[PDB]
């Protein structure tokens, strides 16, 4: 339908030949099927992982490497035909470090990306709507939606397709249009038509657009256009304008990126410099520059080596694996912070009805007044059976199954149930199984009046789909809805208009069904009915109604509570402003009380078990509700976020007496106490900012439309996957699941990448520290160069490679989820840790030196054996009778080097061993935990084998292999590096640990 905002409602209607009620013969919805398709848009695949490439080669610190390899091609084409071997040997040794990183990210980047369309995907989207098949909505398929037939959408919906208003059944409709026309605040919508037929989305003001939200009311529409006509399917992947930003912890290690950036530039510089003597040497040719040439690419290899090219795809990495391994838990992980951010979590808010509990509702209890007479009053009370929504039990009144038509109460009791209600029950054939539409605490009413058939109505007949709303209907047709005052949580009740549908009907005028709050609507009310009879509340009266609504709600069941009355003789129709829901409350007054119903919503399993969990890791459990103080405190007790027989007097507050207190003391109280009840929804919002106010990072866990500003709030909000769109919306994540124990998960998860990022930092710089201080101990101990360019770089993508990524794959520490939170304050790098790294770079960087002299000094059996002063190497054409009959060809010896450079990259590996943990011991925390650092450990140590034993690489890379009793040295340097850092993990792990 084409400008459908243009025409009428009546124009829309007969355009496609359907009745307004009706909606689609299975006929009509065969033939649209065929003309118009499904209601879907062409889904989303992988082929070209090319621009999963394209990003791994983006972050600085790769771009330098990549214009390291480019230079040293510039270089290429200037080398002397003798070691141009060595010359084009470099920059795929550049290279090769940066593609192998490549490989791991895009590779982890697309897993990721494949376990989300498998959750998105998993579970497909409804929609409500009206088809001639069935008397009541039905449930179906969102992508089965064709345009013509009406769909019906209410408070929390999502919208499915294009729709035309044709009628709104609340007294107002507003809508979350964010997504679409770009405008922040929900805006109102009306029935009319907007003559210009150009007019755009803003001036629609009769259209709801898929993909878009329901932020209040309840409303009809005829579909106008699906698919990829929707104004929101035709500007998809000419979209994808999202601009993907970078995770808090992101930015702060690529900051920590140039912070290295600047120092490690500097002590390449501050080499090029402390070497301008060499430029002109026997050895380095012997040219003004040709020397200068040389120590630049000592410079810019030793920067390569020091610079942490792995950081970027390393943190890209662990985040990928973040969202994976979430996914494999069924929680969608909307935003890349939200794992990582999780970590610091202090404080969990969460709402209580369908998030804590499973929102499964169905009244077991429900009283009416039986007898009143002087500070006497009685009740009737009765129970009633099924716990589904299937309309199938019976009420009990002493263990009998009753005729509840028997009771004038109950009677009307059923009628305002039914009437005062915008929720239906629809059967699921495929299923075999009755499903609620709009929210439980309705439908549960449903169900109660399906089960009461107050008006003996034959269902007996009726397929599983008819019984599912007949006796509802029966009520209805017995009075007429003239209007509904829409449900509000500042008045917490909500009412109906009615009068008689024919001229009888129980002609004796016009009524108002309330229902609501206990505690609002038994206030509201002047008068009890006692059957059809009517008397005046008084104070015995009220203060039974309410004992019992007190005891059901705090005892075993913890029963959710709900009042029932009726105006008698409302206002006139017309003394009636419907456009302030302020003035609601005020059109319910003058109330009968009619009775009342206590629902059971058992809370989920996983609840008590996460929260004793969370209270192990530091982490604070607060419930916030709209539900009666009484049955939060109840639930809290049964979830244990409060002891069985606890006082909580300073540790509960109502919304109310919350509002009593003045700011600093709310703010206080937010800090204390656990449990919040009978709460609006400016109030979660406000607890969680007083939270953040002693700055600590909150979360917030919910389903409802009223928790929609706390998870915006919140540093990451959780929505359940049973709840509305518009929670969905606001959330950093949601649990397709529901299971409140991923939570925990994800919190795990989150201190598990942090700790990740650590010892990868820790290994990085402990190494190439090492190695830079195994350079400039070497010029500043007058010995000969230690190592070569490519010598670096092989180290460097030996070291900095495989074995570093490796890291990202620790398992958790072994009290990972047994600290406390990590402050948000707390420090990248600690200052003990930073002792850490110069007390390990340190031993490296004088074990390398050490063994390249031990090839010179106590050269046990090795070929020039030079002893004491060694120092002196340069003053050999010169003073050679210092030197008994020593060539002085043996100081240009490859030798000493290759007994350097295998100690460098055998230390390192040892030193990853140590990044298994920060403070475990590697005895506590066994190597063989991370396999993947093994295997790539492995790969390294071969890989360095093939360049010391395989003919054309040792010239190449000027080494000569070694005596299997030189590597004995090699070890015996390398393998104590383990019990230095393992006594620097003793001292942490029982003086500073935090
Ligand atoms: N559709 C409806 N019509 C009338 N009253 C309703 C209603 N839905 C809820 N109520 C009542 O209004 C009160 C407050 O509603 P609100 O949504 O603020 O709390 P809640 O108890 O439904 C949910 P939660 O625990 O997730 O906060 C409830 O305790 C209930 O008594
Ligand atoms: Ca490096
Ligand atoms: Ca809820
Ligand atoms: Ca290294
Ligand atoms: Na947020």
Same mark, same amino acid.
């Given at each position: 339908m084409e400008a459908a905002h243009s025409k009428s409602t009546e124009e829309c209607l007969a355009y496609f030949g359907v009745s307004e009620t009706t909606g689609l013969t299975p006929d009509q919805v065969k033939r649209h099927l065929e003309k118009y398709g499904h209601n879907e848009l062409p889904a989303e695949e992988g082929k070209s992982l090319w621009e999963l490439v394209i990003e791994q080669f983006e972050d600085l610190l790769v771009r330098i490497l990549l214009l390291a390899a480019c230079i040293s091609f510039v270089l290429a084409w200037f080398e002397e035909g003798e070691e141009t071997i060595t010359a084009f040997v470099e920059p795929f040794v550049i290279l090769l470090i940066l593609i192998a990183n490549a490989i791991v990210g895009v590779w982890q980047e697309r897993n990721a990306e494949n376990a989300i369309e498998a959750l998105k995907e998993y579970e497909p989207?409804?929609?409500?709507?009206?088809?001639?098949?069935?008397?009541?909505?039905?449930?179906?398929?969102?992508?089965?939606?064709?345009?013509?037939?009406? /769909?019906?959408?209410?408070?929390?919906?999502?919208?499915?397709?294009d729709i035309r208003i044709l009628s709104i059944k609340s007294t107002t409709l507003r809508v979350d249009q964010s997504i679409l026309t770009g405008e922040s605040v929900s805006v109102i919508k009306h029935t009319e038509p907007v003559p210009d037929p150009r007019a755009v989305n803003q001036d629609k003001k009769n259209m709801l657009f898929s993909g878009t939200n329901i932020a209040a009311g309840k409303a009809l529409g005829i579909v106008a256009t699906t698919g990829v006509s929707t104004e929101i399917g035709k500007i998809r992947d000419q979209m994808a304008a999202t601009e993907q930003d970078k995770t808090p912890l992101q930015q702060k290690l690529d900051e920590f990126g140039e912070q290295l950036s600047k120092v490690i530039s500097l002590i390449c510089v501050a080499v090029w410099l402390i070497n301008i003597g060499h430029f002109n040497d026997p050895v380095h040719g012997g040219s003004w520059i040709r020397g200068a040439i040389y120590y630049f690419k000592i410079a810019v290899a030793l920067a390569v080596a020091a610079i942490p090219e792995g950081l970027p795809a390393v943190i890209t990495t662990c985040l990928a694996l973040g969202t994976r391994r979430m996914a494999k838990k069924n929680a969608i992980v909307r935003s890349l912070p939200s794992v990582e951010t999780l970590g610091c979590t202090s404080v969990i808010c969460s709402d209580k009805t369908g998030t804590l509990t499973t929102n499964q509702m169905s009244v077991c209890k429900m009283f009416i007044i039986d007898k009143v007479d002087g500070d006497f009053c009685s009740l009737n009370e009765f129970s009633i059976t099924g716990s589904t929504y299937a309309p199938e039990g019976e009420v009990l009144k002493n263990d009998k199954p009753i005729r509840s038509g028997q009771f004038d109460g109950l009677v009307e009791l059923a009628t305002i149930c039914a009437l005062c209600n915008d929720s239906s029950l629809d059967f699921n054939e495929t299923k075999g199984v009755y499903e609620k539409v709009g929210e439980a605490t309705e439908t549960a009413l449903t169900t109660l009046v399906e089960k009461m058939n107050v008006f003996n109505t034959e269902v007996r007949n009726l397929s599983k789909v008819e019984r599912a709303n007949a006796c509802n209907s029966v009520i209805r047709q017995l009075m007429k809805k003239e209007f509904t005052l829409e449900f509000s949580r500042d008045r917490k009740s909500m009412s109906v208009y009615c009068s008689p549908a024919k001229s009888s009907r129980a002609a004796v005028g016009n009524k108002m069904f309330v229902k609501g709050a206990p505690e609002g609507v038994i206030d509201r009310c002047n008068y009890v009915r006692v059957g059809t009879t009517r008397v005046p509340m008084t104070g015995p009266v009220k203060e039974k109604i309410l004992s019992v609504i007190k005891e059901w709600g705090t005892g075993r069941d913890t029963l959710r509570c709900l009042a029932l009355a009726t105006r008698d003789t409302p206002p006139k129709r017309e003394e009636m402003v419907l456009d302030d829901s302020s003035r609601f409350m005020e059109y319910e007054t003058d109330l009968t009380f009619v009775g009342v119903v206590g629902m059971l919503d058992p809370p989920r399993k996983e609840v008590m078990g996460s929260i004793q969990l969370c209270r192990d890791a530091g982490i604070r459990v607060i419930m916030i509700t709209g539900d009666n103080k009484g049955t939060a405190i109840a639930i809290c007790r049964r979830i244990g976020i409060f002891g069985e027989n606890e006082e909580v007097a300073d540790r509960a507050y109502t919304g109310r007496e919350f509002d009593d207190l003045p700011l600093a003391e709310q703010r206080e109280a937010?800090?204390?106490?656990?449990?919040?009840?009978?709460?609006?929804? &400016?109030?979660?919002?406000?607890?969680?900012?007083?939270?953040? &106010?002693?700055?600590?990072?909150?979360?917030?866990?919910?389903?409802? /439309? !009223?928790?929609?500003?706390?998870?915006?709030?919140?540093?990451?909000?959780?929505?359940?996957?049973?709840?509305?769109?518009?929670?969905?919306?606001?959330?950093?994540?949601?649990?397709?699941?529901?299971?409140? &124990?991923?939570?925990?998960?994800? /919190?795990?998860?989150?201190?598990?990448?942090? !700790?990740?990022?650590?010892?990868?930092?820790?290994?990085?710089?402990? &190494?190439?520290?090492?190695?830079? /201080?195994?350079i400039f101990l070497t010029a500043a101990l007058g010995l000969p160069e230690a190592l070569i360019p490519v010598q670096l770089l092989w180290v460097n993508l030996v070291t900095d490679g495989l074995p570093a990524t490796a890291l990202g794959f620790n398992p958790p520490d072994l009290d990972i989820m047994d600290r406390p939170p990590r402050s948000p304050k707390e420090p990248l790098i600690s200052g003990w840790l930073f002792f850490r790294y110069m007390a390990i770079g340190g031993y490296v960087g004088a074990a390398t030196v050490g063994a390249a002299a031990w090839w010179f000094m106590y050269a046990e059996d090795g070929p020039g054996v030079t002893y004491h002063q060694l120092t002196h190497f340069m003053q050999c054409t010169e003073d050679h009778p210092h030197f008994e009959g020593l060539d002085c060809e043996i100081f240009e010896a490859p030798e000493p080097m290759t007994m350097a450079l295998s100690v460098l990259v055998t230390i390192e590996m040892c030193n990853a061993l140590n990044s298994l943990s920060e403070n475990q011991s590697l005895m506590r925390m066994p190597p063989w935990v991370n396999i993947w650092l093994l295997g790539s450990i492995c790969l390294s140590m071969s890989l360095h084998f093939l360049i010391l034993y395989v003919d054309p690489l040792p010239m190449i890379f000027k080494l000569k292999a070694l005596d299997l009793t030189q590597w004995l040295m090699v070890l015996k340097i390398s393998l104590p590096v383990i019990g230095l850092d393992e006594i620097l993990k003793f001292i942490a792990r029982n003086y500073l640990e935090g």
């Open positions: 989207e409804m929609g409500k709507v009206y088809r001639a098949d069935r008397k009541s909505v039905q449930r179906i398929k969102a992508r089965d939606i064709v345009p013509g037939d009406i /769909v019906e959408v209410a408070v929390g919906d999502k919208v499915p397709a937010c800090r204390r106490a656990c449990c919040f009840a009978r709460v609006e929804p &400016s109030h979660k919002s406000k607890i969680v900012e007083y939270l953040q &106010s002693y700055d600590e990072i909150t979360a917030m866990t919910g389903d409802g /439309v !009223n928790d929609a500003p706390a998870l915006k709030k919140a540093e990451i909000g959780i929505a359940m996957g049973s709840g509305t769109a518009v929670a969905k919306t606001a959330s950093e994540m949601v649990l397709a699941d529901d299971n409140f &124990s991923t939570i925990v998960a994800a /919190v795990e998860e989150g201190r598990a990448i942090y !700790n990740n990022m650590k010892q990868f930092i820790r290994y990085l710089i402990s &190494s190439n520290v090492g190695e830079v /201080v195994c």
